[PDB]
């Protein structure tokens, strides 16, 4: 179809606008166009054809036409990635490429690592890690050498990351002498620089794996750090930060070499150089020995306090990191911190201008929370009460975050009655006065209320006054915000035995349930869920049986969260209140969900399936199965599969004695899709019952008789999926004679191709290994184990690989090995005493 | 596309079928018992029937029975001409004769570029088994066609009438077929097509 | 893609669990895995180890255990021959 | 029709008597309000497990513990700088460090941490059958008869903590007779005898390993080839007075 | 994974740490993606934890998980429980073409 | 080339084999034929299903066209849901009934066919005919003739089969020495209905596991 013509890139293709090298030459570029600019159904086919024939086409023309496409500026993230995927599949296919085209591809996909999104970063890493095995060590090393000498900061940054991905892919032991080359190179300055950064991204990508390799890198740090070049010296200091953080306290013995020059750099060069240096030493702090930690921390804290006034952003960010790490030191006392560090902290770094920039606000909050551990919690929050009542809304937000992360760890039990009062007062003030739309306030406020609960009652009343006050408001943002706060505060109210207050909450929310805005309505239903869950059903005001019939129309509201919380709450009434709602109304629920689960949400769809268990416990299981089986006939796969799930859960809660006979008839129905839904529903209903299927196994085997024998690879597939769960949970019951049958029908299917069929059949045979035991399952595998056919062999050695994985000692007695069978045999097997 | 016909399942233990071949197995799919080919949709079934594969298997099954013992540019005004059927008789049986008349230089004055203009009307015997509506069938039609004018048909319930035996002395100018040369006349000067 | 993953998992499972017959495996390579696992279990279970000790009649049981360990390598036959 | 289906009830009347493993630690303090003495021993046969004391110069049944339903392939006590509880490795690959406790009116065996390793079977890749613990109790080491060796760094706190495993993998080297050398807290060092699985000749070569607490990995130190006749290794503690 | 093919696993010797999964992926056995009768908490090698990447969902590799992942009783018997470190290193063609599809 | 032409003859391979008839011509190209013969001819191994070397994807079967869709196990067919829901081109039933069908009625029940140790299902095979076969070897015995085959034979009641006269001259069946037939070795007055004779056997426990009681789990 060639959907969405690209005029410039197509006229860039030229080729056919309207001779085997001309035919492959043409069809190849035609396919490439199918991928880049084309129809989804078309490009999906051109992918399979391009990969199947990827070995046939010459990589010279493949990459010759393909690569320069990505050099244009008119590409889009969609299309560029559509070509990237072909790059990956072809490179991983051919597996061998000449060095010039290796260089071309590495240059083309090299910038991908720098893109802002980890989505592109990931595939940019994938092309390089797949190419590394293709080209090898020597090729890539010959590629990076002329590039590291480039004068372009951009490209140097690019192949820094690229070289790192190569080092991780082929190992950093093989690429390490190259790191020593660009590292220790006396020739070029940028070669030193990038040679140092490569160590950075190597440390980041390896993570903890950098330990065993940390010896060679610290050589480059110690020798190349001494360079007179300020940028070099800085980048080395950053490498110490990354390799220390990823290092974890082990590496101290190695870092002791570079430990010394950092301090003489600190006391002298100052400036941003001291920013990077204190970043490095700060990262060294956790790995320091307790005595050495004691000395060097006390040495650094003076420079920190002196540098509190730094107008620069970077230095403040570093200082916060150094305090963050030094907080864990046992040497510096919480008394020391409260007497000196903390008071000079809260006054300097909590100024309103601090709160303006988020990326700094992060480090501020996390640093403060790390301070809260050593500092007294009541002292920290004591200093944190004044920032709560400030009139700046983002500053109030940061003020909240600090309380959230702090109270989660420590809890508020340290606070006195008075400042505990001023705390909740401040939280209510900032909560009712909030201008900005953000989800944090109700979350963290709820965390505080979960932390302290019995103490809330005299505050618990006014808090709910504010709650209702916001529940009537003209802005849906504040509406759903306050509702989310409700659902969180519901469990706490139970601790004060306010239950009538929960009743009036249930009233007002139930009356506001008719709101037009879905985004708020969902949260309201969530608060309904918390209320009904917490409080006893009998004392619920509306009551429930009046609640649910108003819920039945809600299911058609579409959107998502409305059905999320709606299905959650309908399920809550399903398990909790079987009697209240009338069974015909429950049937209306069944029809509504049965129509509802076409939705694309796995949470809505899964929970929807789960509610049929409660509805099946309350109401007639056959009554549910009528609607379910009637819905199996629909062509839509989600309907078939998740109605099969419903049949499974109903068979779990009701028991298979009811559900299975009607299932078998629904299998007697001639329709394929129905039979598939039956077999899968049988799979799920078996995996949900561990000990039940043992008694039901024999009635299954005549059904699988026509299933496994059926011509359709689908029926054979899903039947094998039945044999998986059935065999796993029924293994060891003594039904092996039936399992022997079920297997005897499976063995002929081993040669069946396709990924789904082959993995379902493998898993089925592995389940049979547990129910039969290897010995017989072996006997088949043995009589087919080698064979001339080169195909039969490849097929059975898969089953024997999985068997060797699960069982080894189990197969030991069963090896058909005799002294005439093999030369050496084992002399000790024939010993008899 | 099914034309409302009911194809019974293979296991229902055989109402006469149009083609007693395409069935539905224990599953919902459609199959050709001879060809042993599975077909997803009735359209695929029709592709199978119109395909040479199925036909070859039909000829093989018949051999088993014996063992066991220009189209594009076609002008079309779709104008119904005037036929004049009349019961004839000679010796020694009864035959039919049709007299079809054509335009009197009324509209054929705008088209004279020797484009099949020399081609006379053509007749063919068609089985009603295939129609645009496919409702009822079971009889033959003596269709008569000319480029501009619209086709014409005449129902022939009698299995055989006037089907002669070596009328002339075996002279071989097939024209279109034995039927046309054997028993048709085209008065092109007066534009009258006789058929008997 | 899928089969291509099965190749990588073939490399990983082969690395962990040592011998796993992939497609073409020489009888010398595979039978060695057989011998190694059988001896492995004979010495691995204190039960079967105690058993082989008596039926063989060695003076001590660890002689049988370390015998099996030595018997895992091919050259141990020629080693016994050189005693 | 009557189903034959013989239903057998298995009982172990007398429990397996061949004692394959032992440990020297002091586990429970019984009948004494406050007492700490290193004299006690716990001995294990596969499934069955027993705990004996002496203290009188004459051995005593303490309690016969419940059946573990597994094959204990090694057992070694660990002593950390406290009640001495035994590290126990068995089938399932799990490294199960268990403390013998007094619960209700009897002694029951409580488990602290079990770490999943390999799979559930008796295997050559399974890092069991060769086990030892640092005599100062800083780290536990498991190995396999052939493939690989794993060494956990054990740390104690308000709750016990097992450090991530330290892996070394030698594909063709069949390991036999793990013996760990005591240290002064310098660095843990263990010794093995590696027989090559795939070789033209029989070659049994000793190998030394020093686990580096600083670099957190095991380091191959000295590979000494000795005659194929080799049997076992033992650790000489110091020779600090000699050279 | 059981369903998406291109997803690559880790398979190293699991450490003491427990893998986290997000509320969105909650309930799936990381191998078979089954919701039934979970047994043992997943354990990952230290190489998959370290810094921020430790907080990721071991299943979808993107979101930050609160919950611990458990193996099901079918995988615990199949032994895939003890196979190695489950994690998804590559984001996968599905999630990729999803992100590039929307933006 | 040389390795392909180095192969020993299959008959040279037969001598190494204790059960030579299993080895086949394609075993000549077995890369390790002396070993593969030992494995394939080992006692309890079950040879690979032979649908390999065919490209038909193991089911092209013409017989697959004529296979019945399904049949309920008669014990489940007792549950009557067959009439309640019509599967061929609400339904509430008693919990005690269904539960008892699987447990009380159907505990000892087992499928009649199953398969054996080495039974492998080849494409052309259909088990059902062999099920009626095994069941028929059970019901039908010599000396008895069903009324249908009797009517087709046109044998009226009380009259002996036509092979009783030729059996008078030739003698009793060599395969059935103990067979008795009215009028000859057996009392004609005992001739009744469809049975004109019966085999008289001349031959004239607890199996350590006898349960002596059968009690199924109760739902209630
Ligand atoms: Zn056909
Ligand atoms: Zn991992
Ligand atoms: Zn997730
Ligand atoms: Zn699972």
Output the 3-class SS for A395-462.
HHHHHHHHHHHHHHHCCCCCCCHHHHHHHHHHHHHHHHCCCCCCCHHHHHHHHHHHHCCHHHHHHHHH
Q: How far is D215 from chain A (nearest CA, A)?
A: 6
- Those of residues 31-50 in F touching chain C at CB distance below 8 A are 31-32, 35
| Closest CA relative to residue A128, chosen from A161, A173, A101 | A161
Q: Does residue B14 share a domain with residue B52?
A: yes
Contact between residue A740 and residue F150 where contact means Cβ atoms under 8 Å apart:
no
Structure tokens at E97: 């073409």
Contact D214 A806 (CB under 8 A): no
> At F218, phi and psi to the nearest 5?
-90, 140
H or E element that contains B31: strand B30-32
How far apart are alpha carbons A126 and A124 in whole angstroms? 5
DSSP string, A137-201: HHHHHHHHHHHHT-S-HHHHHHHHHHHHHHHHHH-HHHHHHHHHHHHH-SS-HHHHHHHHHHHHH
How far apart are alpha carbons D227 and D201 in whole angstroms? 11
Adjacent-strand bridge partners of B127: B140
Q: Does residue B185 share a domain with residue B122?
A: yes
Q: Is C15 on the interface with D (CB under 8 A)?
A: yes
The total domain count for chain E is 1
Is residue E5 assigned to a domain? yes
- Under DSSP, the state recorded for B136 is -
List of chain F residues whose C-beta atoms are within 8 Å of the C-beta of residue A748: 49, 51, 58, 120-123
Domain coverage including residue B96: 70-196
DSSP string, A698-759: HHHHHHHHHHHHSS-HHHHHHHHHHHHHHHHHHTTSS-HHHHHHHHHHHGGGGG--SHHHHH
Residues 6 or more apart in contact with residue A673 via CB below 8 angstroms: A632, A633, A634, A635, A640, B28
DSSP percent split of chain F into helix, strand, coil, nearest 5: 35, 5, 60
| Closest CA relative to residue A285, chosen from A254, A241, A316, A317 | A241
Ligand number nearest to the C-alpha of E61: 3
List of chain D residues whose C-beta atoms are within 8 Å of the C-beta of residue A808: 121-124
Contact between residue A431 and residue A441 where contact means Cβ atoms under 8 Å apart:
yes
- Under DSSP, the state recorded for D39 is -
How far apart are alpha carbons A73 and A385 in whole angstroms? 53
Q: How far is the CA of B11 from the centre of ligand 1 (A)?
A: 18
Ligand number nearest to the C-alpha of B20: 1
Contact between residue D42 and residue D28 where contact means Cβ atoms under 8 Å apart:
no
DSSP string, A342-382: HHHHHHHHTSGGGGG-HHHHHHHHHHHHHHHHHS-HHHHHH
Q: Does residue B106 share a domain with residue B37?
A: no
Q: How far is the CA of A732 from the centre of ligand 4 (A)?
A: 19
Structure tokens at F86: 């019509």
Q: Which residues of A243-280 are buried (b: 16+ CB within 10 A; e: fewer)?
A: bbbbbbebbbebbbebbebbeebbeeeeebbbbbbbbb
Structure tokens at B136: 């009822």
In three-state secondary structure terms, A493 is: helix
Q: Which of D113, D164, D165 to mutate to test the interface with E (most CBs of E within 10 A)?
A: D164
How far apart are alpha carbons D118 and E83 in whole angstroms? 7
List of chain F residues whose C-beta atoms are within 8 Å of the C-beta of residue D9: none
Look up tokens 């070995």; give the residue. A55
Contact between residue A367 and residue A330 where contact means Cβ atoms under 8 Å apart:
no
Structure tokens at B118: 């020399």
C-alpha distances in Å from residue F218, one per residue of A688, B57, E37, F34: 22, 60, 26, 59
Contact between residue A505 and residue A531 where contact means Cβ atoms under 8 Å apart:
yes
Contact between residue A127 and residue A88 where contact means Cβ atoms under 8 Å apart:
yes
| Closest CA relative to residue A125, chosen from A168, A157, A177 | A168
Q: How far is the CA of D117 from the centre of ligand 2 (A)?
A: 14
Structure tokens at A47: 């992918």
Adjacent-strand bridge partners of B156: B140
Pairing label, strands F197-199, D173-181 = unpaired
Neighbours of A171 (CB within 10 A): 13
H or E element that contains A594: helix A583-596
How far apart are alpha carbons A152 and A149 in whole angstroms? 9
C-alpha distances in Å from residue E103, one per residue of A78, A404, B106: 8, 33, 68
Torsion from C-alpha of A797, A798, A799, A802, nearest 10 degrees: 120
DSSP string, A95-137: ----HHHHHHHHHHHGGGGGSSSHHHHHHHHHHHHHHHHHH-H
Contact between residue A111 and residue A73 where contact means Cβ atoms under 8 Å apart:
no
How far apart are alpha carbons A546 and D22 in whole angstroms? 69
Cα first-last separation, chain E = 25
Contact A668 F72 (CB under 8 A): yes
- Under DSSP, the state recorded for A786 is S
Sign of the alpha-carbon dihedral angle for B114, B120, B124, B130: positive
Residues 6 or more apart in contact with residue D14 via CB below 8 angstroms: none
Query: Do A and D make contact, counting contact as 3+ CB pairs within 8 angstroms?
Result: yes
Sheet holding B96-101: strands in order across?
A: B86-87, B96-101, B192-195, B184-187
In three-state secondary structure terms, D237 is: coil
Contact between residue F196 and residue F181 where contact means Cβ atoms under 8 Å apart:
yes
List of chain C residues whose C-beta atoms are within 8 Å of the C-beta of residue D231: 66
Q: Does residue B32 share a domain with residue B15?
A: yes
Structure tokens at B189: 């000067």
How far apart are alpha carbons B48 and B54 in whole angstroms? 6
Contact between residue B19 and residue B3 where contact means Cβ atoms under 8 Å apart:
no
Q: Does residue B100 share a domain with residue B163?
A: yes
**What angle do the packed helices A457-471 and A476-495 form, to 10 degrees?**
150
Contact F214 D2 (CB under 8 A): yes
Contact between residue D63 and residue D56 where contact means Cβ atoms under 8 Å apart:
no
H or E element that contains A393: helix A393-409
Residues 6 or more apart in contact with residue E77 via CB below 8 angstroms: A728, A731, A770
Structure tokens at E46: 């230290």
Burial class (CB in 10 A: 0-12, 13-18, 19+), A14: exposed
How far apart are alpha carbons E29 and E78 in whole angstroms? 13
| Closest CA relative to residue D62, chosen from D26, D20, D19, D12 | D26
C-alpha distances in Å from residue E18, one per residue of A510, A522, D156, E70: 41, 33, 19, 9
Q: Which residues of E23-54 are buried (b: 16+ CB within 10 A; e: fewer)?
A: eebbebbbbbebbbbbebebbbbbbbbbeeeb
Residues 6 or more apart in contact with residue B132 via CB below 8 angstroms: none
How far apart are alpha carbons F120 and A749 in whole angstroms? 11
Look up tokens 């050559």; give the residue. D124
How far apart are alpha carbons A412 and A451 in whole angstroms? 7
How far apart are alpha carbons A691 and D42 in whole angstroms? 38
Contact D124 C37 (CB under 8 A): yes
Contact C66 D228 (CB under 8 A): no
Structure tokens at E37: 């009768």
Q: How far is B33 from chain A (nearest CA, A)?
A: 14
Burial class (CB in 10 A: 0-12, 13-18, 19+), A694: middle
How far apart are alpha carbons A673 and A712 in whole angstroms? 11
Task: Dump strand ranges (E) for chain D.
Answer: 21-23, 41-44, 49-53, 60-64, 72-77, 86-90, 95-103, 106-115, 130-133, 139-143, 148-155, 161-162, 166-169, 173-181, 189-196, 204-212, 217-226
- CA angle centred on A736, ends A731 and A739, rounded to 5°: 90
How far apart are alpha carbons B171 and B79 in whole angstroms? 36
Contact between residue B102 and residue B150 where contact means Cβ atoms under 8 Å apart:
no
Residues 6 or more apart in contact with residue D32 via CB below 8 angstroms: none
C-alpha distances in Å from residue D233, one per residue of A43, A315, A789, D139, D230: 65, 57, 50, 20, 9
Q: Does residue B127 share a domain with residue B93?
A: yes
Peptide bond between residue A543 and the one before it cis (omega within 30 degrees of 0): yes
Largest CA distance in chain B: 65
The total domain count for chain B is 2
Contact between residue A477 and residue A432 where contact means Cβ atoms under 8 Å apart:
no
Q: How far is the CA of D188 from the centre of ligand 3 (A)?
A: 40
Pairing label, strands D139-143, E20-21 = unpaired
- Under DSSP, the state recorded for A55 is T
Contact between residue A261 and residue A221 where contact means Cβ atoms under 8 Å apart:
no
Residues 6 or more apart in contact with residue F8 via CB below 8 angstroms: F28, F33
Chain centroid, CA F130 distance in Å:
4
How far apart are alpha carbons A65 and A80 in whole angstroms? 14
In three-state secondary structure terms, A798 is: helix
Q: Does residue B31 share a domain with residue B101?
A: no
Look up tokens 């035609």; give the residue. A30
Pairing label, strands D148-155, D139-143 = antiparallel
Domain coverage including residue E81: 1-98
Largest CA distance in chain A: 92
| Closest CA relative to residue A777, chosen from A785, A765, A795 | A765
How far apart are alpha carbons A53 and A47 in whole angstroms? 10
Chain centroid, CA B85 distance in Å:
20
Q: Does residue B170 share a domain with residue B134?
A: yes
How far apart are alpha carbons A255 and A274 in whole angstroms? 18
| Closest CA relative to residue D49, chosen from D90, D11, D82, D78 | D90
Breaks after residues in chain A, judged by C–N over 2.5 Å: 18
- R_g over Cα of chain D: 20
Adjacent-strand bridge partners of D74: D89
Contact between residue D72 and residue D126 where contact means Cβ atoms under 8 Å apart:
no
List of chain F residues whose C-beta atoms are within 8 Å of the C-beta of residue B23: 65
Neighbours of A303 (CB within 10 A): 18
Structure tokens at E83: 């196979």
Q: Does residue B196 share a domain with residue B122?
A: yes
**What angle do the packed helices A342-349 and A313-326 form, to 10 degrees?**
150
How far apart are alpha carbons B70 and A574 in whole angstroms? 73
C-alpha distances in Å from residue F4, one per residue of A687, A789, F8, F28, F31: 50, 14, 10, 10, 9
Contact between residue A167 and residue A141 where contact means Cβ atoms under 8 Å apart:
no
Q: Is F65 on the interface with D (CB under 8 A)?
A: no
* Structure determined via: cryo-EM
Breaks after residues in chain D, judged by C–N over 2.5 Å: 81
Q: Is D187 on the interface with E (CB under 8 A)?
A: no
**What angle do the packed helices A172-184 and A214-225 form, to 10 degrees?**
0
Is residue E103 assigned to a domain? no
Q: Which of E11, E16, E47, E50 to mutate to test the interface with D (most CBs of D within 10 A)?
A: E16
Contact A806 D5 (CB under 8 A): no
Chain pair C-F, CB pairs under 8 angstroms: 3
Residues 6 or more apart in contact with residue D205 via CB below 8 angstroms: D193, D194, D195, D196, D223, D224, D225, D226
Q: Which residues of D215-228 are buried (b: 16+ CB within 10 A; e: fewer)?
A: bbbbeeeeeeeeeb
Contact between residue B29 and residue B46 where contact means Cβ atoms under 8 Å apart:
no
Chain centroid, CA E75 distance in Å:
14
DSSP percent split of chain E into helix, strand, coil, nearest 5: 25, 15, 60
> At D62, phi and psi to the nearest 5?
-100, -70
Q: Which residues of A723-746 are buried (b: 16+ CB within 10 A; e: fewer)?
A: bbbbbbbbbeeebbbbbbbbbbbb
| Closest CA relative to residue A590, chosen from A562, A557, A629 | A629
DSSP percent split of chain A into helix, strand, coil, nearest 5: 75, 0, 25
């Amino acid at each position: 179809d060639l959907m969405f013509f690209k005029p410039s890139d197509h006229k860039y293709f030229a080729d056919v606008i309207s001779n085997k090298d001309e035919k492959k030459e043409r069809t190849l570029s035609m396919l490439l166009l199918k991928i880049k600019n084309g129809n989804t159904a078309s490009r999906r086919t051109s992918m399979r054809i391009l990969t199947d024939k990827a070995v046939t086409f010459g990589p010279e023309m493949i990459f010759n036409r393909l690569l320069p496409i990505l050099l244009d500026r008119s590409l889009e993230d969609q299309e560029r990635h559509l070509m990237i995927k072909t790059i990956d599949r072809v490179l991983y296919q051919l597996g061998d490429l000449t060095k010039p085209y290796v260089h071309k591809i590495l240059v083309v996909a090299a910038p991908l690592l720098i893109d802002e999104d980890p989505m592109v970063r990931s595939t940019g890493q994938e092309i390089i890690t797949n190419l590394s095995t293709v080209a090898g060590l020597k090729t890539i090393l010959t590629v990076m050498r002329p590039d590291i000498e480039n004068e372009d900061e951009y490209v140097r940054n690019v192949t820094s990351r690229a070289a790192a991905v190569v080092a991780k892919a082929l190992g950093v032991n093989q690429l390490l002498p190259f790191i020593n080359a660009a590292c220790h190179s006396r020739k070029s300055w940028k070669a030193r620089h990038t040679g140092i950064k490569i160590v950075q991204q190597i440390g980041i990508l390896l993570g903890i794996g950098v330990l065993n390799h940390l010896t060679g890198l610290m050589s480059c740090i110690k020798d190349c750090l001494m360079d007179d070049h300020v940028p070099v010296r800085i980048v080395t200091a950053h490498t110490l930060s990354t390799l220390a953080e990823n290092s974890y306290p082990y590496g101290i013995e190695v870092f002791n070499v570079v430990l010394e020059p950092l301090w003489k750099g600190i006391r002298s060069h100052r400036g941003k150089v001291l920013s990077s240096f204190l970043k490095a030493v700060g990262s060294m702090i956790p790995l320091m020995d307790p005595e050495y930690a004691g000395y060097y921390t006390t040495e650094a804290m003076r420079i920190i306090r002196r540098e509190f006034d730094s107008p620069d952003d970077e230095m403040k960010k570093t200082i916060l990191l150094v305090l963050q790490k030094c907080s864990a030191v046992e040497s510096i006392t919480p008394k020391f911190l409260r007497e000196e560090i903390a008071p000079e902290f809260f006054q300097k770094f909590w100024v309103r201008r601090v709160a303006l920039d988020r990326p700094l606000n992060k480090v501020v909050t996390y640093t403060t929370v790390t301070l809260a551990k050593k500092l007294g919690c009541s002292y920290t929050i004591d200093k944190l009460l004044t920032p709560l009542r400030d009139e700046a809304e983002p500053f109030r937000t940061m003020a909240v975050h600090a309380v959230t992360r702090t109270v989660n760890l420590l809890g508020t039990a340290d606070l006195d009655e008075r400042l505990e009062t001023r705390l909740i007062d401040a939280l209510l003030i900032a909560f009712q006065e909030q201008t900005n739309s953000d989800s944090i306030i109700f979350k963290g406020f709820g965390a505080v209320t979960v932390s302290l609960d019995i103490r809330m009652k005299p505050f618990l009343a006014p808090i709910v006054s504010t709650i209702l006050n916001h529940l009537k408001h003209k802005t849906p943002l504040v509406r759903q915000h306050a509702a989310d706060l409700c659902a969180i505060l519901i469990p706490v109210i139970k601790n004060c035995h306010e239950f009538e207050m929960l009743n009036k909450l249930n009233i007002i929310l139930y009356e506001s349930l008719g709101e037009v805005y879905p985004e708020v309505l969902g949260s309201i239903i969530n608060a309904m869920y918390c209320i009904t869950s917490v409080m006893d059903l009998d004392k619920l005001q509306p009551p429930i049986n009046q609640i649910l019939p108003t819920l039945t129309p809600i299911l058609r509201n579409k959107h998502r969260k409305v059905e999320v919380n709606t299905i959650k709450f309908v399920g809550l009434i399903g398990k909790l209140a079987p009697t209240y709602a009338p069974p015909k109304e429950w049937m209306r629920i069944c029809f509504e969900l049965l129509e509802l689960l076409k939705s694309t949400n796995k949470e809505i769809r899964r929970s929807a399936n789960a509610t049929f268990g409660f509805i099946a416990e309350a109401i007639g299981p056959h009554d549910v199965l009528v609607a379910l089986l009637n819905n199996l006939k629909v062509q839509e796969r989600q309907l078939r599969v998740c109605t099969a799930v419903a049949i499974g859960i109903v068979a779990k809660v009701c028991g298979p004695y009811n559900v299975l006979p009607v299932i078998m008839n629904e299998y007697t129905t001639p329709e394929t899709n129905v039979q598939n839904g039956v077999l899968k529903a049988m799979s799920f209903m078996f995996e949900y019952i561990g000990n039940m299927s043992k008694d039901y196994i024999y009635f299954i085997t005549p059904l699988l008789e026509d299933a496994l024998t059926d011509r359709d690879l689908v029926h054979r597939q899903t039947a094998s999926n039945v044999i998986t769960h059935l065999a796993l949970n029924c293994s060891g019951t003594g039904h092996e004679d039936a399992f022997i049958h079920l297997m005897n029908l499976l063995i002929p299917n081993i040669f069946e191709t396709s990924p789904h069929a082959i993995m379902r059949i493998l898993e089925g045979l592995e389940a049979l290994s547990q129910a039969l035991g290897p010995g017989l399952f072996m006997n088949y595998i043995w009589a087919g184990l080698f064979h001339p056919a080169k195909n039969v062999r490849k097929a059975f050695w898969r089953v024997y690989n999985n068997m060797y994985v699960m069982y080894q000692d189990a197969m030991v007695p069963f090896y058909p090995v005799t002294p005439d069978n093999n030369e050496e045999y084992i002399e000790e097997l024939d010993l008899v005493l | 596309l099914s034309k409302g016909e009911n194809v019974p399942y293979t296991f229902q233990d055989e109402q006469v079928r149009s083609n007693p071949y395409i069935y539905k197995n224990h599953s919902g799919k459609l199959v050709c018992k001879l060809c042993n080919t599975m077909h997803m949709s009735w359209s695929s079934v029709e592709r199978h029937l119109g395909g040479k594969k199925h036909g070859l298997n039909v000829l093989r099954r018949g051999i088993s029975i014996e063992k066991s013992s220009x189209x594009x540019x076609x002008x079309x005004x779709x104008x119904x001409x005037x036929x004049x059927x009349x019961x004839x008789x000679x010796x020694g049986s009864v035959g039919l004769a049709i007299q079809v008349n054509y335009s009197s230089e009324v509209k054929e004055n705008s088209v004279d570029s020797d484009d099949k203009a020399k081609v006379p009307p053509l007749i063919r015997i068609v089985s009603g088994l295939e129609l645009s509506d496919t409702k009822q069938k079971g009889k033959k039609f003596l269709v008569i066609a000319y480029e501009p004018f619209e086709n014409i048909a005449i129902e022939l319930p009698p299995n055989e009438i006037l089907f002669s035996e070596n009328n002339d002395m075996d002279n071989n100018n097939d024209g279109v077929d034995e039927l046309n040369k054997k028993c048709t006349f085209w008065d092109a000067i007066s534009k009258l097509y006789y058929v008997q | 893609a899928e089969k291509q993953r099965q190749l990588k998992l073939q490399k990983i499972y082969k690395q962990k669990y040592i011998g796993l017959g992939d497609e073409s495996t020489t009888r010398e390579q595979w039978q060695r895995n057989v011998r190694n696992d059988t001896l492995n279990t004979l010495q691995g279970h204190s039960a079967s180890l105690e058993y082989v000790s008596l039926s063989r009649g060695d003076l001590s049981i660890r002689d049988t255990r370390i015998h099996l360990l030595k018997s895992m390598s091919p050259g141990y036959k020629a080693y016994l021959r050189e005693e | 029709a009557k189903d034959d289906e013989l239903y057998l009830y298995h009982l172990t009347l007398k429990k397996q008597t061949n004692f394959v493993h032992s440990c020297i630690g002091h586990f429970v303090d019984l009948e004494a309000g406050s007492k700490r003495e290193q004299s006690q021993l716990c001995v294990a046969t596969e499934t069955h497990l027993e705990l004996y004391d002496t203290a009188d110069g004459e051995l005593k049944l303490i309690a016969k513990f419940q059946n573990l339903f597994a094959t204990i392939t090694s057992m070694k006590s660990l002593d950390l700088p406290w009640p001495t509880f035994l590290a126990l490795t068995s089938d399932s690959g799990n490294l199960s460090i268990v403390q013998i406790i007094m619960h209700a009116g009897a002694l029951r065996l409580k488990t602290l941490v079990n770490q999943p390793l390999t799979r559930t079977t008796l295997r050559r890749v399974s890092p069991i059958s060769y086990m030892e613990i640092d005599p100062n109790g800083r780290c536990i080491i498991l190995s396999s008869v052939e493939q690989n060796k794993l060494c956990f760094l054990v740390d104690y706190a308000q709750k016990l903590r097992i450090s991530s495993p330290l892996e070394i993998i030698r594909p063709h080297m069949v390991t036999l007779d793990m013996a760990v050398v005591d240290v002064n807290f310098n660095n843990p060092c263990f010794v093995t005898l590696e027989i090559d699985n795939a070789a033209t000749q029989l070659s049994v070569h000793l190998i030394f390993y020093v686990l580096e607490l600083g670099l957190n990995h095991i380091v191959k130190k000295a590979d000494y080839l000795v005659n194929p006749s080799a049997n076992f290794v033992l650790s000489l503690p110091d020779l600090s007075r000699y050279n | 994974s059981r369903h998406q093919f291109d997803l690559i696993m880790c398979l190293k010797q699991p450490g003491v740490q427990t893998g986290l999964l997000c509320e969105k992926c909650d309930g799936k056995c990381p191998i078979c993606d089954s919701y039934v009768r979970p047994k043992r908490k997943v354990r990952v090698c230290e190489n998959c934890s370290f810094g921020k990447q430790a907080k990721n969902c071991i299943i979808c590799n993107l979101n930050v998980g609160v919950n611990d992942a458990f193996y099901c009783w079918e995988c615990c018997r199949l032994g895939k429980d003890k196979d190695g470190c489950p994690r998804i290193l590559n984001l996968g063609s599905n999630r990729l073409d999803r992100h590039f599809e929307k933006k | 080339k040389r390795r392909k032409t180095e192969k020993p003859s299959l008959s040279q391979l037969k001598s190494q084999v204790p059960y030579p008839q299993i080895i086949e011509w394609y075993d000549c190209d077995a890369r390790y034929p002396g070993l593969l013969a030992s494995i394939k001819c080992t006692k309890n191994v079950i040879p690979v299903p032979s649908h390999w070397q065919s490209k038909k994807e193991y089911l092209s079967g013409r017989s697959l066209l004529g296979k019945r869709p399904f049949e309920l196990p008669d014990i489940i067919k007792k549950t009557n849901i067959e009439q309640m829901r019509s599967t061929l081109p609400a339904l509430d039933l008693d919990y005690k009934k269904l539960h008892d069908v699987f447990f009380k009625i159907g505990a000892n029940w087992k499928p009649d066919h199953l398969l054996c140790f080495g039974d492998v299902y080849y494409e052309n095979r259909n088990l059902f005919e062999e099920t009626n076969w095994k069941r028929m070897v059970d019901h039908k015995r010599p000396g008895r003739i069903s009324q249908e085959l009797r009517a087709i034979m046109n044998l009226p009641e009380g009259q002996l089969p036509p092979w009783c006269m030729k059996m008078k001259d030739i003698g009793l069946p060599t395969g059935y020495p103990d067979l008795k037939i009215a009028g000859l070795n057996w009392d004609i007055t005992n001739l009744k209905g469809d049975v004109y004779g019966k085999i008289i056997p001349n031959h004239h426990r607890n199996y350590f596991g006898a349960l002596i009681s059968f009690e199924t789990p109760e739902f209630e």
